[PDB]
Design an enzyme around this catalytic site. Structure first.
Site, PDB file in Angstrom:
ATOM      1  N   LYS A 164      77.569  -3.297  13.772  1.00 49.19           N
ATOM      2  CA  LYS A 164      76.988  -2.417  14.783  1.00 49.19           C
ATOM      3  C   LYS A 164      76.678  -3.172  16.072  1.00 49.19           C
ATOM      4  CE  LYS A 164      73.589  -1.195  12.159  1.00 49.19           C
ATOM      5  NZ  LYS A 164      73.961  -1.880  10.894  1.00 49.19           N
ATOM      6  N   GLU A 190      64.691  -4.858  16.599  1.00 47.53           N
ATOM      7  CA  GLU A 190      65.817  -5.733  16.323  1.00 47.53           C
ATOM      8  C   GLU A 190      65.413  -7.192  16.533  1.00 47.53           C
ATOM      9  OE1 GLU A 190      69.386  -5.104  15.366  1.00 47.53           O
ATOM     10  OE2 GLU A 190      68.068  -3.656  14.375  1.00 47.53           O
ATOM     11  N   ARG A 191      66.386  -8.094  16.441  1.00 49.13           N
ATOM     12  CA  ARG A 191      66.106  -9.522  16.495  1.00 49.13           C
ATOM     13  C   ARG A 191      65.774  -9.979  17.911  1.00 49.13           C
ATOM     14  NH1 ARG A 191      70.508  -8.648  13.138  1.00 49.13           N
ATOM     15  NH2 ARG A 191      70.268  -9.407  10.993  1.00 49.13           N
TER      16      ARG A 191
END
Ligand SMILES: Nc1ncnc2c1ncn2[C@@H]1O[C@H](COP(=O)(O)OP(=O)(O)OP(=O)(O)O)[C@@H](O)[C@H]1O
Ligand SMILES: Nc1ncnc2c1ncn2[C@@H]1O[C@H](COP(=O)(O)OP(=O)(O)OP(=O)(O)O)[C@@H](O)[C@H]1O
Ligand SMILES: Nc1ncnc2c1ncn2[C@@H]1O[C@H](COP(=O)(O)OP(=O)(O)OP(=O)(O)O)[C@@H](O)[C@H]1O
Ligand SMILES: [Mg+2]
Ligand SMILES: [Mg+2]
Ligand SMILES: [Mg+2]
Lengths: 471, 478, 471
Positions: A164, A190-191
């Site tokens: 993704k 997210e990261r």
């Protein structure tokens, strides 16, 4: 007076009691600013959002940061308005948190700047625009089987580690640098490493001068993970409405918003839903997704990556978000494990733009023929699984022969993927994609080995690498 | 002016609690201080549970709730034709207020056993497969069930468009969809001219759960007004699963204990009450009818699920759309083995009944026999003829989007197929054969079309056979 | 004289408070007959049934109709007795609702007519009759593999759309026209369209003068659906006890009684059971079913249609219902998908009457041989679907050859199936069907095509239908 007191602290949920007849409305922002009176206290600077009216002059709120250090009886101030974040030309080239405060170390924003509330109703029925226009991406499978729509909503489903983020980066590289309009990136849960990498990539590529970024990553508490998307959305809405420009809106993971909502829901006092989700899963997602739309003033095209928990496409969060999308691409772990690297499911992915009057008659026919052959191969896979290809009839053997080559040609080498495999990426026009797939369907390249169709762009590269290998 | 008043205790997620309102009525409309309406569902010993029919942001604890004295009602009348409205009756197209002088309750008893008449007149959808294999009659309720992106909305749009000349009012209810999708549907209807007799009720995803819960009831209440005046109405519920989910949300918010999959106990009673109001009235009641086409969305083709099972147990029939059939090239993807109509035969023209009395069972047997004999060698000539006939029928039943076909041409092509005149035509050419056959009838077979259109029975087989043979002689196989 | 007042309304459940020492007994009926005082109210005529005693002089009741319009504080009247419905020759030719009020517009029942209470204890052990006798139905599969018992209990299991209603109608057509006794139909929780169609068919056939009908359907609240069966049951019990007649009892769907009972358990305040059913599932089902029995004073033979949710025969409602029946007919949609009707499962169907001393030695042996052949055939399909028929031995090929023909000949064309088949129906005697199945087992008609056995009746019609295909 409009000053409250902390009554209960239960993780990210805080209850505040106000005086009679002075309760804040729902979605109002509350502020706690406390100085440590002695060595057994800590300094506190926390903001809360009103969620429910519990009765008896009590209000239940959700915190936007950690609640460690809160003491019962702390004074709470009501701002009288929902969360407001700066909007306009000032936000271009800057990085913000959920509260609209810059985090890029380039200085603050003047207090006289215009700022808009986070919560607002969706555009009415009579304001929407329903034009359908093809958006070319340069990816073979997307351009052929599920074209993207300019000004529409696009979702990318997939499990953990399927591609993704790589697909988001490839789309950004292919489209954002040439779009011309304003681009907004809104990561959600997210990261932070990925956020920093994207920030440096944009800064080096120079597209940072016309983009705004908002970040509420996995480290953050559920309130921030819930409201970061709305902050980015209102920042994009300013450009859509007040200036009538085309806006690119990238959301890194919209599933994390519903996940944070489900985390908050239990403490708010709601009974759990079927799979432990909040009972208000559908309405909360709907009142967010309905704001992301194109209107008569301007158009917003949004690409959203959607996480699928435990590879269960029937999970309620992935299940309810299909109805909000015009085009979807479904990534599959089985296709990525065989090396097919864009991993787009050719039968699960659908788009509204796949119509003969939109993409062309020959485009439509080629896409339908490819889908038919792939469906037949999927049907035969059960028999090949047990007893191999020997008992198949001459027709089914030819179907398998064509389907394997089509499936391998659906793969592509990406510019972003050059860091993983040293090979350079490719950009394939839709006309070339159609011509190549028509040639493969016609049986022009039945004699070529099937391994020569992997990770190439135009159909000429298949012949080139087949010649490079033994032929 | 005086009215019974209450005070608000709790506010949140579209649910409110009120103290007072001692003389409130179960199901009565109530209004808040800011003008937002509400509905009283729970009448407890000391407090009332109110569901808010609008934006609850401006409602705060301590505000006053005011009785209206009216059971939940919606406006009805001919002024709603050609308009898109809220489930409460307010227009959302921006074309001005609707001039309705009449209203109906949203919860009303269904017509009784003695008030009905057996369904005996056809409803033409314009789709060959539906008109031949799964007939739909006026007053019948037919379920359309399948996975996502299988053509469920397209079938309903085509059916609504096909009613252009036939005297019928159409009602399209959209629950939980994007307003952009609703606008696209409205634009398609305006393009094809169906908006001159169609009412569309919309309840988008951003609306609160009570609006989604009440939209189908508002639609059927609007339809009943025309039904009891002797008119014929067609109602489409584009998603009952989303309405069920909204009702589950409301029930969980009202602290009602959950059951299977967190659904409430009366999830079956909800849909049964909604769908039992569609009926064919007797001549003493006016002779009007109301036909419904509810929608159910499955997950990965799973039919044993709770809501699909409940809805299948209620409706008179179901139409199955399958993704594997859709991608194999047969569109519409109707599964002949699983689809069935409990009123079939009585809801067909005489000619169609003659030509396709057995075709559904024929296709079911052909599907059974194709799975058998696949491993073997198709040795028997009988098996080798059954397969050939089945292939021709399957290729004939295909149809394109927005291409309606008159029943007089449908019966002719079904006759040509079933009498054996297609036995000497290859499978790859029968679609073009039919396309040219329609033009051949338009040019030289006008009398047959007129006879079928006037007297609902077939003409004499001799002339029909002669015309088919003439077309066969003219036709060339590619 | 004593009265109560409504204190709480929760959907179909209403709570009424009475004075001290004047509480109504459980299962008693209560009446609300409010007249609208002004324009803010509506007229109400509603009947309630006492279910629980909550303490503090409060009674929890279940409503027999819609509760819309109720207001807290409405006066309630106690009738001092359970629901009572008219019994006798008055009920013949009439159509009633759950309350015993006629709905056929033929006039009202005189107030002096005899009325019996709905609830009563079950018959005792001494007074039961156990003699077994064959009831001929004219259906080949039923007469061969699972004969019905005169005075016994017959249940028809099946999912949605398998043919339960059509089988009920065919059995009515075959039996009730020549029964000679009284028949009662209970329309519990089914389609009003089906009820109207059945009423008109009986009116046209003339059986209406010999039968009584009671209808509580899908649109009705749960109380009506859970008491209409008892209304029909007491109407049949009057004839069984007082006149000693032979009574046919038809129940449209007995699963709706269970479903309606489960819909209100949570509002009554009981903790859920395994699959969401009420804890008193088996107790209520037994208390209802045990009243439907034949005694020394008279005999009642009852045919009931039983719904199987999601085709799962392990569902608690059918699982508990199985133990209450003497003869059992199972319908599987696997046979329905293949075009075989009435689609009776030839193996799962059982009957206490299939014994050598009850039905005869030749019949018993031919039925057992048919069952053995079909059981052998069922195992071969799994290996056939993979390895093909060519790998089967000569014995198994013949087994399949005869089993397919037997399964196809198990089909039949019903009189009521004209609407669905065009061709008329037939009536096949037990001797003729036994002879035909014996011939097919012996293999006389191996040369006939298998399609010639579809919906044919006798083997004579098979061999005549073969001529139409040139065989
Ligand atoms: N086009 C591609 N070419 C080569 N490898 C790829 C490609 N796309 C994805 N991969 C591989 O898949 C890995 C995971 O990709 P990515 O980070 O995009 O996944 P994701 O779906 O975002 O996962 P997560 O849930 O962990 O965020 C990459 O590190 C890489 O090894
Ligand atoms: N007969 C047909 N021939 C060709 N294309 C068709 C046909 N019927 C439907 N389609 C196409 O199939 C796609 C899906 O149809 P549609 O959106 O009506 O399905 P749906 O089940 O209502 O979907 P959703 O789950 O998105 O609500 C559309 O692109 C439509 O144009
Ligand atoms: N013997 C038969 N001959 C021909 N067609 C039949 C026969 N039995 C059933 N069918 C077909 O199958 C359908 C089954 O409908 P039916 O009302 O009998 O279902 P059911 O199993 O009683 O279900 P339910 O009452 O739950 O709706 C019929 O409407 C008809 O189309
Ligand atoms: Mg990722
Ligand atoms: Mg749709
Ligand atoms: Mg039935």
């Amino acid at each position: 007076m409009t000053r409250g007191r902390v009554i209960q602290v239960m993780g990210p949920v805080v209850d505040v009691k106000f005086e009679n007849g002075h309760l804040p409305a729902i979605y109002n922002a509350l502020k706690i600013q406390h100085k440590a009176r002695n060595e057994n206290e800590v300094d506190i600077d926390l903001t809360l959002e009103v969620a429910l009216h519990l009765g008896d002059d009590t209000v239940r709120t959700i915190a936007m940061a950690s609640t460690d250090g809160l003491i019962r009886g702390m004074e709470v101030i009501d701002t009288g308005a929902p969360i407001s974040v700066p909007v306009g030309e000032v936000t271009l080239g800057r990085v913000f948190n959920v509260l609209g405060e810059p985090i890029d170390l380039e200085g603050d924003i003047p207090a006289d700047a215009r700022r808009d509330p986070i919560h607002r109703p969706a555009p009415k029925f009579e304001e929407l625009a329903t034009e359908v226009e093809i958006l070319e991406t340069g990816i073979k499978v997307v351009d052929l089987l599920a074209p993207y729509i300019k000004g529409g909503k696009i979702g990318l489903f997939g499990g953990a580690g399927v591609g993704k983020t790589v697909l988001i980066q490839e789309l950004i590289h292919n489209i954002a640098q040439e779009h011309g309009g304003i681009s907004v990136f809104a990561g959600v849960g997210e990261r932070t490493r990925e956020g920093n990498d994207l920030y440096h990539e944009m800064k080096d590529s120079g597209v940072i001068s016309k983009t705004a970024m908002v970040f509420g990553q996995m480290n953050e508490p559920p309130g921030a993970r819930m409201r970061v998307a709305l902050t980015g959305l209102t920042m994009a809405e300013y450009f859509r409405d007040e200036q009538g420009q085309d806006v690119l809106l990238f959301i890194d993971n919209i599933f994390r918003f519903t996940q944070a909502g489900s985390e908050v829901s239990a403490l708010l006092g709601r009974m759990p839903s079927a799979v432990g989700y909040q009972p208000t899963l559908a309405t909360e997602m709907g009142q967010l997704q309905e704001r992301i739309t194109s209107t008569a003033k301007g158009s917003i095209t949004s690409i959203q990556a959607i996480y699928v928990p435990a590879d269960d496409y029937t999970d309620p969060a992935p299940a309810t978000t299909f109805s909000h999308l015009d085009a979807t691409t479904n990534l599959e772990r089985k296709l990525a494990e065989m090396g097919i690297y864009p991993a787009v499911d050719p039968l699960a992915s659908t788009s509204r733009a796949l119509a003969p009057e939109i993409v062309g008659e020959e485009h439509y026919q080629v896409a339908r023929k490819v889908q038919q052959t792939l469906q037949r191969y999927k049907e035969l896979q059960d028999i090949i699984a047990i007893l191999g290809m020997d008992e198949l009839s001459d027709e089914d053997k030819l179907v398998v022969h064509r389907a394997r080559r089509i499936q391998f040609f659906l793969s592509q080498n990406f510019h972003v993927a050059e860091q993983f495999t040293g090979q350079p990426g490719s950009y394939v026009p839709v006309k070339e994609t159609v011509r190549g797939f028509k040639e493969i369907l016609e049986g022009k390249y039945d004699h070529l080995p099937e391994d020569a169709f992997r990770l190439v762009g135009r159909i000429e590269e298949v012949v080139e690498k087949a010649k490079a290998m033994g032929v | 002016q005086v009215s019974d008043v209450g005070t608000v205790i709790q506010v949140g997620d579209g649910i409110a609690r009120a103290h007072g309102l001692d003389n409130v009525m179960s199901g009565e409309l109530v209004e808040f201080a800011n003008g937002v309406m509400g509905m009283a569902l729970n009448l407890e010993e000391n407090n009332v549970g109110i569901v808010i029919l609008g934006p609850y942001t401006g409602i705060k604890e301590g505000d006053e709730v005011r009785r209206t004295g009216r059971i939940m009602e919606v406006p009805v009348g001919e002024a709603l034709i050609g308009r898109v409205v809220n489930p409460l009756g307010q227009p959302v197209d921006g074309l001005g207020p609707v001039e309705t002088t009449e209203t109906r309750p949203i919860e009303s008893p269904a017509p009784g056993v003695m008030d009905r008449r057996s369904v005996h007149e056809p409803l033409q959808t314009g789709i060959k497969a539906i008109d031949a294999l799964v007939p739909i009659g006026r007053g019948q309720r037919e379920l359309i069930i399948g996975d996502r992106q299988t053509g469920k909305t397209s079938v309903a749009i085509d059916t609504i468009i096909n009613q252009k000349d036939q005297n019928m009012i159409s009602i399209y209810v959209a629950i939980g969809q994007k307003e952009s999708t609703v606008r696209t549907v409205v634009e398609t209807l305006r393009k094809h001219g169906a908006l001159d007799y169609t009412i569309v009720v919309t309840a988008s995803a951003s609306q609160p759960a009570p609006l989604l819960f009440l939209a189908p009831y508002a639609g059927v209440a609007m339809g009943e007004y025309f039904m009891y005046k002797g008119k014929h109405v067609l109602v489409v519920y584009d998603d009952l699963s989303k309405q069920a989910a909204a009702y589950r949300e409301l029930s969980l918010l009202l602290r009602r204990p959950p059951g299977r999959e967190a659904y409430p106990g009366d999830i079956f009673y909800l849909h049964s009450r909604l769908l039992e109001r569609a009926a064919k009235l007797s001549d003493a009641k006016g002779g009007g009818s109301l036909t419904a086409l509810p929608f159910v969305e499955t997950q990965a083709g799973d039919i044993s699920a709770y809501i699909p099972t409940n809805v299948i147990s209620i409706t008179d029939g179901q139409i199955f759309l399958q993704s594997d059939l859709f991608f194999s090239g047969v569109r519409p993807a109707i599964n002949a083995g699983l689809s069935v109509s409990r009123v079939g035969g009585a809801a067909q023209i005489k000619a169609m009944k003659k030509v396709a009395g057995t075709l559904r069972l024929d296709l079911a047997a052909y599907r059974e026999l194709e799975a058998f004999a696949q491993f073997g060698s198709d040795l028997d000539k009988a098996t080798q003829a059954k397969l050939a006939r089945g292939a021709r029928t399957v290729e004939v039943l295909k149809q394109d989007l927005h291409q309606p076909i008159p029943v007089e041409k449908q019966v002719l092509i079904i006759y040509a197929l079933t009498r054996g005149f297609l036995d000497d035509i290859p499978v790859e050419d029968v679609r073009r054969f039919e396309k040219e056959f329609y033009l051949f009838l338009d040019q030289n077979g006008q009398h047959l079309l007129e006879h079928i259109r006037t007297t609902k029975d077939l003409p004499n087989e001799d002339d029909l056979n002669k015309a088919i043979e003439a077309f066969k002689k003219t036709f060339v196989v590619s």
